[PDB]
Each structure stands twice: as structure tokens, then as C-alpha cells.
Design a protein around this ligand. Sequence first.
Ligand SMILES: Nc1ncnc2c1ncn2[C@@H]1O[C@H](COP(=O)(O)OP(=O)(O)OP(=O)(O)O)[C@@H](O)[C@H]1O
Ligand SMILES: Nc1ncnc2c1ncn2[C@@H]1O[C@H](COP(=O)(O)OP(=O)(O)OP(=O)(O)O)[C@@H](O)[C@H]1O
Ligand SMILES: Nc1ncnc2c1ncn2[C@@H]1O[C@H](COP(=O)(O)OP(=O)(O)OP(=O)(O)O)[C@@H](O)[C@H]1O
Ligand SMILES: Nc1ncnc2c1ncn2[C@@H]1O[C@H](COP(=O)(O)OP(=O)(O)OP(=O)(O)O)[C@@H](O)[C@H]1O
Ligand SMILES: [Mg+2]
Ligand SMILES: [Mg+2]
Ligand SMILES: [Mg+2]
Ligand SMILES: [Mg+2]
Lengths: 356, 370, 359, 357, 50, 110
Amino acid sequence: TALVCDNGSGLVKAGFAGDDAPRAVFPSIVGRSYVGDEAQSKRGILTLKYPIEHGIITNWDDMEKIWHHTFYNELRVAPEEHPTLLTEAPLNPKANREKMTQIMFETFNVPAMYVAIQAVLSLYASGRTTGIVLDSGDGVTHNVPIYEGYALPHAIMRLDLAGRDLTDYLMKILTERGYSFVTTAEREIVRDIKEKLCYVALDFENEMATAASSSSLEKSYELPDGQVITIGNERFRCPETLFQPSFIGMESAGIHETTYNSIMKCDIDIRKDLYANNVMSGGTTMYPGIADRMQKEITALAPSTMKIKIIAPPERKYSVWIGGSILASLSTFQQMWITKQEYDEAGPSIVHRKCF
Amino acid sequence: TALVCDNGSGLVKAGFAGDDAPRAVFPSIVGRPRHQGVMVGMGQKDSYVGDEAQSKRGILTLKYPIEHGIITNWDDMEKIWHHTFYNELRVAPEEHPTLLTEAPLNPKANREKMTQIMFETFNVPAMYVAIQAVLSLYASGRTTGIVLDSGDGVTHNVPIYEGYALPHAIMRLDLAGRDLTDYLMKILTERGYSFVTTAEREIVRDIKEKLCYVALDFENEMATAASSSSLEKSYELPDGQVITIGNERFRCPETLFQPSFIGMESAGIHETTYNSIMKCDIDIRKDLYANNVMSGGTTMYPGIADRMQKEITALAPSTMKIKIIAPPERKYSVWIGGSILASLSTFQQMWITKQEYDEAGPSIVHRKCF
Amino acid sequence: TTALVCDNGSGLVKAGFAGDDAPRAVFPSIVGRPRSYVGDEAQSKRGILTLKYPIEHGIITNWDDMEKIWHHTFYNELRVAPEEHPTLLTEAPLNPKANREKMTQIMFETFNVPAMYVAIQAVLSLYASGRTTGIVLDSGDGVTHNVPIYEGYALPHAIMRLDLAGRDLTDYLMKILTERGYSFVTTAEREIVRDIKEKLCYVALDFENEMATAASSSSLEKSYELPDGQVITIGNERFRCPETLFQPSFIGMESAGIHETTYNSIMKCDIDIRKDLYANNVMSGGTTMYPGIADRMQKEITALAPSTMKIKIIAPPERKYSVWIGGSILASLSTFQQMWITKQEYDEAGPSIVHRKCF
Amino acid sequence: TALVCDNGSGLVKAGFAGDDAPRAVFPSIVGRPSYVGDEAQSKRGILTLKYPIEHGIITNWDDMEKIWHHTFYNELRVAPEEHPTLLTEAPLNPKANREKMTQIMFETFNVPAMYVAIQAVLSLYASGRTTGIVLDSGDGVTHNVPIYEGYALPHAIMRLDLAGRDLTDYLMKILTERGYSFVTTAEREIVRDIKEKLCYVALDFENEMATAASSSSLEKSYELPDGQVITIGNERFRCPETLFQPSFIGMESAGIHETTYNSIMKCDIDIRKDLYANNVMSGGTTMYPGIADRMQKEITALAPSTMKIKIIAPPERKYSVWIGGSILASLSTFQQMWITKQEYDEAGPSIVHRKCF
Amino acid sequence: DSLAIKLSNRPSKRELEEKNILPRQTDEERLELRQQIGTKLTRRLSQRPT
Amino acid sequence: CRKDSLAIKLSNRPSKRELEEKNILPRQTDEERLELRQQIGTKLTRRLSQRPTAEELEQRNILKPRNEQEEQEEKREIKRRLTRKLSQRPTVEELRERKILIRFSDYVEV
Ligand SMILES: Nc1ncnc2c1ncn2[C@@H]1O[C@H](COP(=O)(O)OP(=O)(O)OP(=O)(O)O)[C@@H](O)[C@H]1O
Ligand SMILES: Nc1ncnc2c1ncn2[C@@H]1O[C@H](COP(=O)(O)OP(=O)(O)OP(=O)(O)O)[C@@H](O)[C@H]1O
Ligand SMILES: Nc1ncnc2c1ncn2[C@@H]1O[C@H](COP(=O)(O)OP(=O)(O)OP(=O)(O)O)[C@@H](O)[C@H]1O
Ligand SMILES: Nc1ncnc2c1ncn2[C@@H]1O[C@H](COP(=O)(O)OP(=O)(O)OP(=O)(O)O)[C@@H](O)[C@H]1O
Ligand SMILES: [Mg+2]
Ligand SMILES: [Mg+2]
Ligand SMILES: [Mg+2]
Ligand SMILES: [Mg+2]
């Protein structure tokens, strides 16, 4: 039975190929050794380091700790007994994936492994091999146009604005409300508030006006301490940052604009295929109303007669993983695995050739 | 560590104080797309500076922020300085005192605007503005003499006494390297070689830099050129095509001494040097004649110092001591001077501090820099 | 000042700015009038309104509709003022004198351009690859041409025209897919089949051998999922479709195939330049986009020509738009700036000036 | 017909002007109980052997005369008085040294004409250039030599006493650490052959070490003369890695890429672009597969982001020095450049400085 | 069930470069190429016979 | 066995490209080699005929005349003299008095 591992900036999603959901989902942190939730509990006593930032592995020792915890503690398996599909970020450097392969074979002695692009797996999860993916997670957001399963590297857009930044911004606006949110535990509470109560406005100005006219948009959240708080326009100002990054002092264009730019860098002939297939994936795409707003904006930028379809299934928060789970369970995929013998023969070079 | 930035009409020279040569030299151009690209969104990469702009010249229209030594487009100038700090020198402007150069007779409002922009936009802890010709003089260890500074867009005669430029006696000539390149293109074209394209213009510029020289006796050199193939030289184009150049080698820079070659009524650089010397007090004239410092790329032609010696000797009193100073490093001597000046210990009081600017505003530069 | 480039196809107009690597706007050349919309907008409203084709077989036949297309090009697609830009237009090989004269008249009087030029499509195709001598196979939506060119001069006596192109290939693909039992009679169905042709078709290197391969195994078969979610399997139709270019008899035409017409075009030229023509076959147009067509052409031309003749087929991936690219390059050359017909010159000589000025 | 003699620290390359390759290539050793080169190596057991040229500079004149005698008479089979002779010299060769070369050539061998050319300059000429920067790495010494219009720029020349012989020694050491014993001279020759046949320069050293430890993909097999079979792994790329990391053999010196960059930086800024775009590699120690790509990567890493970098490394480069000479001495315009016997008779050893530059 | 069908019909990377879908050269490369072609064109059109 | 020495030798054989780079398998005809050597020779004769002299290269600031120490000396001396000259620098009024700054309102900001 094969394994599927999605290495997120915030959350690692891990499980077995063929399964509907990841068996284990846990934060990707290393404590100095403690990993994930357990590391967070001991976070006070020892300093914590984020091995994956903006989707790219930067601390290999810590990554080895994370993978060890994944295999042994979370899934309860022997790594030498399972083929392993790992995910990587768009535009991941050659040396980086080579190192992933090296560690998988040398450290964990896996019989087989594969490395797939997250956005591509997200696309496959929707039953497509052609379309444009907006993958927004904890640390990084990407636009990845894909044709026939091939990611188009020249047209990929990267934005270092994601869920954690939105959480921080929500904390900032909460400070504007008169509520103090400085602590890590408090940060966790704010993250939960964001996930439960936030949404993306279809028309930002109109929604601001509605928020100014009445308490109708205001909602109430009961804190663990039993204190009750009221949130108003903060509900939609928070994810609005995705469309107006200028809200946090970034000069970058918003996600609709980066989608449009990604589409434009591609050959004219495929643009129709891209417009009709927008797949959204990642936790930061989970906000209610985000699909309608994206539809409106892309329709506003594209030619008047162009067909626009935004695809955003409910499972999208884990869709990356799901894609992998599907991919590793296909019979025709079985030849695609890099076997331990093959890796022994060709070394790290094989991953580039074998995986695409 | 202080920074030194010489803002040329053609080339920006930038580097660190105390260094023997500028770290970065790049064309002073700002490039902006000809038409709105197929790219929407705030934070677009509008504008290209220097080498990248020259490479991308086909796609976008190019603008000269500094023409004839004076800054005319402030936004573009800000682009150039940003590129200088971040891309070329790889430094944080708030972490370094900055010495900028300026042209002779730079307007007061203009330098005031320079200071204001440096402090408000780049948040430098300190800065200073020095006259280019004066720095050129300083580079040779002098504080008194007359400088001929000929660059890409403009040529100046600047007489200087005790570190003070004498404004009433400064001469400006709008004939420089760029004009010489154009003239060389014209005379090579007259010869039957076609140099109409921009790439061809660059090639002609290279021909000028590599093969041209200033004749000591122009008529005699014309006669030699007509008598034999001895003066002829050969240049190999990038396409491997080979061309032969004859009198164009010395006819091109001869324009500096005879501007009428390009239809100008102006006196030559020797005559303007003489006039500049004469506009100064008689008592200092001896000191000026004995200290002619040449700086800038357009003074790099072999033989120009000797010719200048001959002409000035011909114009000056029979018993006057004439000395022309033209070191091999002169192409960058302006910058070099700055590098030296900003590295002097006694200079440390001279910087305009951010606090002083806070107190007095743009006005402070006039009192502090002279 | 930025020049404009407009390639007026029978099926697709390619338009953009001089100096750009690719056309800014590409749209179908249709004009819609209630039973006015142009191109894609016209296609969307096609049900509501009747559609007219201003360009047929590469030659302009309906001038009002053409004026509508040009207006849509300048104002809607490119967002420019025509009086503010020199304009390079393309024309078909063997374009009548009156036709290009009318092009010039409309450009200067109706659109008030400061300057304009008319270039042969095949010549621009040759120019885009940095060449001025060779033989071009330009196959678009409505017409296919072989145009031999020496030092920028198209050789009119040696030009071959074939009224078999992409649209005809789409129709043939519809017919053969229909024979298999999938019904593609309707216009929407015509569009899905056209997309199928673009995505799945290729030119066989050896047609009989490929037929044999198709008969021997399911290896060539591919699957296409229709909009209704129905799934179809396509076999030899993949290569039988573009084979019509080499064997027009497939659609009841008596004409020779494109390789034979290439050879004939070469033979109609003077023998001394013939070597130069063989070593420089440039393929351009959408109907040349089929994978394997260059190799096939290489094999066939080698088969017709003397045994030792050096044959080189030039078919870059961008070739579908190479015509436009050529114009974009040509109009962006500094030395070309004198070549433009200025509005003053037009005022002086009238429509007549284009013949003298453009060649 | 003119002669061309490239006086290597390890190998003498000798031949005739106009030829594409040297007729004779032999080790520069002198054996005394006199035997030179190959014969000395054959008789190496009976007699002790001495290296007349060390680190590119002639140090033993009697032995050098022996080498030249063997070159003329035994190897090329010619009479020296009947041929103009182009000799090569190391960069920064002392004045007295080249003077002695000239004196010996005219008085002892009675040549009608001769010339002394800088090796790196000849290397540059062989590629048809007169301006660029040469990395000349041989048996005994490595140089970076920037050259403008045929003139070597002495102030910017870098000398590194790390070369092929040192790499061979290091390979012996690391193979020994692996457990194969190579102490004797014959064993040394075997190791040198292993180095020439199996070594290469890794593009990314850490990744290649990791690859070598992760799998057998890099392992190669060498069959010893005794029929014993040995396996070599990372030693393949650890050996030439010393050129970029001299610390591997206890040297504090910078690597060849850093010395290339420093040499470039020591030159005037205006010619610097011309230097970056013309890196010519010459000498046997530049023959390792992958060295050009690694140099490209490192120089790209050191130079300005927009700087154009070009590494020139033709397959023939191991003898390119000689080739340059072969071309130069066969040019018609060069015929005037020779120092004639009359001129030498008139001016003495002094003339070489004036005539050759 | 549709995925695998779409996976059987995947083009080769070359085959995608053939369709001008995957660039075969950097932007800078395409630019240098364009400049070269342009200078060629200029030179040839200059000596164009009558 | 012997077939094992052979099997181990067969497994090791390089690519044709690898031999090519090692100059074992040439990449061009002896004719083409001749062409190339000729072109090189003529280019060389041209550039050599045009080759400038050493002093011409020194006045271009390419061939550095002064040694490292001597240059350091001149640099130090320049710094010294510049400092000593800059300290002894008069006032604007002192110059106006000496009929050197002919115009009033020139340098009055000081
Ligand atoms: N329902 C929700 N509404 C809003 N935000 C959410 C929701 N669920 C999760 N998030 C945010 O999404 C992030 C986690 O999403 P995901 O698991 O896709 O990130 P990741 O893949 O680990 O990040 P990356 O892709 O950058 O490595 C968290 O920061 C969380 O705040
Ligand atoms: N060796 C040379 N011979 C002749 N001309 C040269 C030489 N080197 C540079 N130049 C010319 O000098 C010019 C550059 O000089 P410099 O950098 O001093 O001008 P600048 O400071 O940019 O202009 P300005 O002083 O007007 O602001 C170029 O136009 C170039 O053509
Ligand atoms: N990848 C492809 N494979 C096969 N055919 C294609 C492909 N892409 C486009 N085509 C065909 O190319 C045609 C478009 O060609 P093009 O736009 O050059 O014609 P045009 O210039 O409008 O016509 P004309 O040259 O006759 O005026 C369409 O009919 C389309 O079916
Ligand atoms: N194919 C090869 N790969 C790697 N190294 C090689 C190869 N062939 C020869 N060498 C090395 O090159 C060295 C000889 O190079 P070269 O002949 O350029 O030196 P040299 O000219 O005699 O010495 P110097 O340049 O110091 O005077 C030998 O020590 C040998 O180890
Ligand atoms: Mg993810
Ligand atoms: Mg200047
Ligand atoms: Mg066409
Ligand atoms: Mg050598």
C-alpha cells in the first residue's frame, strides 16, 4: 500500500493511497526534538523552527524529523514497506527535489517514491489534466496553469500572501476594534474565528456600506474564557487582502489579477481551456463567497464572450492530498514510481526524468 | 562606508569611497514601454534602467534623464538612483552617506530638489553635492587650476581657485562624445559604409573609442592620409565583416577644436579654455595656465593633450608656462576625486546630516556645499 | 510612434503592435447582422443574427464588412487611434491591383492613418525567420499557397494556389468521424470536431505504414471527451484528416498534393535559384501545425528532387502566426521607416502609389 | 620548416610549424646513472630521475640542454641550425631566465632564428584571439593570465602552485584511505592513468557527495595490471575538486574560479567585459569533464548579474599552447618577428626583451 | 475513471514544445534571437537587387 | 570469470559524446580542420598587424607602469596633499576682497 504526503508550510497532510481523506494532518513545526502539536505544547520551554517556508524546504534536518514523525508516529508504518508520493511547491529548485529523493531513499530506505507538483495534484483531484489552479495555503499562494498534466513553469505566479498573513491582519484589525490579541494561544483563537466567521464579499464597497448601515453583518464569537465578542466588517476585510494586497503594504497584484496575468503568459490557443477551468485549492480558498468574487473579477478582465468557470469543491482544503491519493492508486501510475533499484542505478538524476 | 555617485549624461559611475575605481558603470537611461502591456495589476514592473534597458531597447521607448549635465526628469532620476543603490551596488541607502556629483552652473532649485529627494525618498543619514570638474581637479591633488571636463552630452571649462569654482568664468559647450559619435557615423557613411541602425551606431562608437586620435597638425595629417595608406587602420565588425578607416580617425575628434565641422559657430575647446582663463583675475592666470586638468571620456583620444598644449601655447603670452595634465585614469577621475574626498578624515564634519536637513530643509546644501 | 500589424486571414485576423513577439488580438473574421457584431461577439450572437465572410480564399470581397472588421480591430481589440499609428497590412499572393488600391484608399481616407504598407503574407513568413530567399507554403483557413521568393521578390509566374485548407480538413474530419458512426452534422458539432482536429491530428511519415499500424493494434487510438461527457475513441482519423493536404483526392479534388505543388512551384522558377529554394522551405499558417508534417514534407521533396539536393524544411513551433511575426519585425526595422507610404504621398498620387512603393 | 617546443613542467611537446598536433610528447625528466624522457623512465629502476623544469620555470640548465638535444636529435630527428625555433615560456618568467634560453639557443644549438612566446598567450592565439583571460593548468603550475592585444598584464597575473601532479598525489592519498595501496612510482603512474580516465568535476559538489553515498551510480571499475579489480566512487570528483577547494591538500590559496575572478578584477574596468566573455582553458589539468560548466557556474556567481560569461574549452586544449605556437610560427607576417643569428650576434641575450613582448 | 483516460492521452514534453505551448528558450534568448534576425533582415534588404 | 572482466569493462564504456570531448572521436573533417586553422591564421595576422605598442597601452590605463608599492605611495601622497590643501582654504569674503569673485551674490549662501 502506497503513502501520500503533502508537505505544507503550515500543515502536513499524510495518509494512504486510495483513502478519501488524509489519515493524519498536523502542523509542520520542529522544536528544539519535538514535532507538530506536541512541539506546540512544549513551545514555551524550547524554541520552534518552521522547516518549510513559502512552500520550499529550507531546513533538511528538521524536515527529516518531520518525515520521521510522519512515518513512525502519525501513520504507524515502516517506511521500507511503502511506496511514497511526496508533494513539492511550484517552481521547486532541482537540487531541492533531488535532496528529497536522496533523503527518501538513503534515510528512510523506501522501496519506491514519486514527487508531484501540488497544484497539478489539485487539478487531477477534480478529474482534469488541463486548467489553471489557484493554490493558496498557509505560507504561499500560486497560480499554476497546466496543460495535459504539464505545469507551465514560465506562467506560474507566486505570491507570498496566504492564510497566516490573513490571520495576522485579522489580529491587527481586532486591535483596531479595541480587543487585545498578542499571544500564540490567542493567535490560535483568532485563526479559528477567521475560519468560522470570515467570508469573501462579492462587492467590497457595497459590503462596506452594508456594514456601515446596520449591525446586520456583525456576528458573535464566544471565546474559550466565555467572553463574547462582536465582529463586523472584519469578516470580509480580512480575506479582501487577497484581492487588495495593498491592505498590508504589499505592492503585489491581487489573486484575480495574478490569475489573469498567468493566463496571459500562456499561448493564445490554450487561454480558452484555462478560463473554462479554474480550480481553487488550499485552505485559504475555503472562504465562503470567494468563488463568486473570483468569477466576477475574471469575467471583468477577460474578453466579453469568453466562458469562465470557477471550480471549488468543498474538499479543496485537502484536495492536493486527495489528488495524490488518487494518483498513487491508479494502475497506470505503477510504472511511474521511481524504484529503489532505479534510484540506485541512476541516482538523484532520475527524479527529473521519471517525474513530470 | 560612504557611497560615491557621478551622474553622467551618458554614463552613471557608482561605487564606494576609498576605492580606486567605481564598482559599477552603466548607461544613464530609463526605459518605459511604448504602449500599455497585456498585464494588469498594481506593482507592475514598469520601467527598466541601464544595461537591461539597453538590451530591452526594442520593446520600450528610452529616456535620457540627464541632458547636458543637468537633471530634467526627476521620476526617471529616482529610478536610476534606486537601481544604483539596490541592483548595482547592493546597499541600503539609509546605511550610507552619499556623495553625489553635479554639473557646473547647476541651478540652485535643482540641487535643492536633489537634496530633498535624497533625504525624503532614500532616507540617507548624510549626503553631499560636489561639482564634477572640482572633483576631477582634486583627484590630481590640486585645489587650483582649470579643468576641461568633456563627457557624453556636454563639455565644460571650469576655472577653480582654492577649491572654489569661479562661476563668472565658466564656459559651456554643447559638443561632446555623443556628437562625435554622430559625426563619425556621418563621415563613415559618406565613405560608403552604411551606419544607420542603432547597433551600427554602437559599433561606430566602438570604432571611435578604439581607433580615433587627435592630430597634432591637422593639415599635415590630412596630407599624410592622402599620400599613403600609413594612417589607415582596419576594424572587424561583429558579423565578421571588415572595414578600413582612414582620416576619419582624426577628423572625428578634430570637431572639438573646429566645431564648425558639425555646423556650430562656437569656438573650439582651446579657445574656450583661453577665454575662461581670461575671464579670471589676472593674478590667478599663471596658476590656471600651469594647471590644465582634463577629465571625461571625450578627453581620452591619444594626442589631445599635446594638441591642447600647442594651441594654448599659441594663444597665451610667449613667456607663459603651460602645463596640460591628462592622466590615463582621467575617464573616471571625477568619480575618483569623489572617492578620495569622501574618504578623507577631515571631510567627516562636511557631510549634511539628516538632522541638519531636518532643521533647515533643502536650503542647507548651499551653505554646507561649496 | 508605434506601428500596427494586421494580418487579414480568411478565417482569423491576427492583429498587434510592431515590435511585439506575438499578436495582441486574434479573432475570427466574421461580420454579424440581425436576421452589428464582429468576430467572437458575432460568433456568440450567431444564432440571433446572420453572418457574412468578408475575406474568402485570402482575398477581400466585401468592403463594408472589411471596414467593420478594421474598425473593430483598431477600436475594440487594440484600443488605438488609427491616425496615430503607421499600419502594415498583409495581403494574399496574386492579390488584384484594384484590391490593394482599395485597401490603400480605405486606410488613408476612412481611418486617416499617417502611413501604411501592404505586404505579401508569404514574404513576411519568409522574413520572420530572417530570410529573404526561399519557398513558402502558407496554409491557413481558406486557402493554401506555394510562393517562391528571391531576394524579397515573390515570383508570380511560379506561384501555386490550392483551395484546400484548414476548414476543408475540418469538414473532412467531420465526414470520416461520421462514417465511423459519431454524428457531427451540426455547427456546434463542427466546432467540437475542429477542436478535435487541433488537439489530436498529426501527419503520418508513411501513410500506408501508419494505416497498417492502425489496423494492427490499438496503439494509435486516443480518447476525446465530448461536452456532453460522452467519450469517443479516434484511430486512423488522426492522420487520415491532414493526409488530404498530400492527397486532395480524398475530398474529390483532382489537384496535386502540397509536396507536388511545392515541387512544381520550384520547377517553374529559374534553375539557378532552385538550389536556394530547396534548402529554404518555410511553412506557415495554422494548417501547417500538424506534428510530423515537416518530416513528411522532407521525405516527399527528397523523393521528387534530384537525389543529392540538400533539402531543409523550416517549421518553427510559432509558425501558425509567423506571417504576423514577420510583419512585426519588418515594421519595427529602422530602415523600413522610409518604406511606409505617407498620407502626404497618398494625397499626391492617390491609390496608385501602393504599386510603386510596395513590392 | 620552423620548430615548436612547449617546455612543460611534466611534458615536452615538440613538433613542426603548420602541423595540427605535436609530433612528439614526452615526460620532461633527466636520468643519470644520460637518459631523457621515455628512455629515462624505462631505465628509471637503474638510475635516479630528476625534473629540470619545476613549476613552469627552467632551473637546471645542463639538464635542459640535454632535453633540448634529445628533442632535436632523438625525437624530431632534425639539425637545429637548419630551423627557426619557437620556444614557450611560463608567465612572469624572469628576465635572466629567458635571456639564458636565448643565449643557449643561439650559441649551443646554432639556430638561424628563434622566438620565445608566453604559453598562455599562445593558448589564446590558438583560438584565434588576442584578448581574453587564459587559465593554463598543467603538470606543475596553474596560471590565470589576462591578455589585451597580445600583451599579458603582469600586475593581474595569478600563480598557483597547484596542478595535475598534485591532483594525482591527492588521488593516491584518498584511494589509499579507501584501502587500496599506491606508494611506488609505478603505482603512481597507474593512479595518474586512473585520474585521466575516470575523474571528473562535479557541478554541485555536495549533491554529488550525497549521490555517491546514496547509490552506486557514480562507482566505476578499474582493472589493475595484476588483473585485480578496484572500485572508485567519489574519488572521481573529490580529486579535481581540489582545484576549487585547495584546502583539500592543505593550501590556504583560493580556488581557480576565485583566482580567475580576482585576476579579472585586478585589470582595468573597461577591458573587464572583454575578459569575462573570453575565458580560454588550456593545459592537461583542464581536461576533466564538467570543468567548463563548473567554471561557468562559479564565475557567473562571482560576476555582476548582467555580465556576459563565456568559457572556451575546445577538446584539443591539452596541447593548445603548442598549437598556438604552431600557428604563429607559420604565419607570413611572423617571419620578420624572429630573432636572427646576426641580430643576436650584435645585441646578445638582450635582444629577446626588445624583439619578444 | 475519466482521469486515467486523460492520462493515457498525454503528449510528450517535446510534443508540447512543438505546439508552442512550452517555450524552448528564455525570454532573453528570444530577445537576442529577435535582434539577430532583425540585423540580418536589415543587411539583406539593404543589398536587395532591383 | 574472464567474461566478468569483460562485463565489468562493458558496463563502464563512456558515451560517444564523452569520447568526442576527450578528443578521441573528432567532430570535424580534416578539411574542415584546415578551413578553421586557415581562418584563425588570417584573423591572427590581421590583429597582429594592428597590434598596438606597450606605451600606447599604458596611456590607455591598461598596462600599469608603477609597482604596487609605488602606486600605494602616490595614492597616499595625493591624499596627504589634498588634505593639506583643503584645510588651508580661504573664505568667500576673502576672495571677493581679492577681486577674484567678480560678481556679488555669488557664493553668498556660505
Ligand atoms: N475554512 C477556512 N477558512 C479560512 N481559512 C482557512 C480555512 N481552513 C484553513 N484555512 C487556512 O488555510 C491554511 C492551511 O491551508 P493548507 O493546508 O492548504 O496550507 P498548506 O498547504 O500547509 O500551506 P502551503 O501550501 O503554503 O504549504 C491555514 O493557515 C488556515 O488558516
Ligand atoms: N578611449 C576613448 N576614446 C574616445 N572616447 C571615449 C573613450 N572612452 C570613452 N569615450 C567616450 O566618452 C563618453 C563617456 O564619458 P563620461 O562617462 O565622462 O561622460 P558622462 O560623465 O556620462 O557625460 P557628462 O560628463 O556630460 O555628464 C562616451 O560617449 C564615450 O564615447
Ligand atoms: N494545432 C493545430 N493543428 C491543426 N490545425 C490547426 C492547429 N491550430 C490551428 N489549426 C487550423 O489552422 C486554421 C487557421 O489558420 P490561419 O489563421 O493561418 O488562416 P487564415 O490566415 O485566417 O486564412 P487565409 O490564410 O486563407 O486568409 C484553422 O482552420 C485551424 O483549423
Ligand atoms: N584527460 C585528462 N584528464 C585529466 N588530466 C589530464 C588528462 N590528460 C593529461 N592530464 C594531466 O595534465 C598534466 C599534463 O598537462 P600539460 O602537458 O599541460 O602540463 P605541462 O605543460 O607539461 O606543465 P606546465 O604547464 O606546468 O609547464 C598531467 O600531469 C596529467 O596528469
Ligand atoms: Mg499545499
Ligand atoms: Mg562626467
Ligand atoms: Mg495566413
Ligand atoms: Mg603548458
